[PDB]
Amino acid sequence: SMKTAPPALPTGYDSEEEEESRPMSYDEKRQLSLDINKLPGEKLGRVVHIIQAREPSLRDSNPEEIEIDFETLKPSTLRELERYVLSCLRKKPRKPYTIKKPVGKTKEELALEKKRELEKRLQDVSGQLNST
Numbered sequence: 001s002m003k004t005a006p007p008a009l010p011t012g013y014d015s016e017e018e019e020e021s022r023p024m025s026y027d028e029k030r031q032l033s034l035d036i037n038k039l040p041g042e043k044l045g046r047v048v049h050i051i052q053a054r055e056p057s058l059r060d061s062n063p064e065e066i067e068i069d070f071e072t073l074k075p076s077t078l079r080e081l082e083r084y085v086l087s088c089l090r091k092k093p094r095k096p097y098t099i100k101k102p103v104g105k106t107k108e109e110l111a112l113e114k115k116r117e118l119e120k121r122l123q124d125v126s127g128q129l130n131s132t
Helices: 026-036 041-052 075-089 107-125
Strands: none
Touching: 026 075, 041 075
């Protein structure tokens, strides 16, 4: 008895990952290179194709002598990478992300927004000069 997958939205909402697009942990990707190494050379040549076609510096480099440098590669290309690899591995997307701290969403933030309104209110209540 496993959980069945919910219907996903490929349209309507959007921009969830597009406005996100952040660099991942170097741990995950650099060790993932060894999991890509488990795939046959012909499969690496397909991975390198989808990389180099987006990465203008890597298209000039030979796909045999290729260097997949995760730190200089685009965050979106790292997304397309994990998608391609997990699809080849045929394995489930068991990587449940969890937020540790809200980071920006603090009482200090809400205090600053509240204060900004309070500063504005000083000028807002004030009447304008009738320049004759």
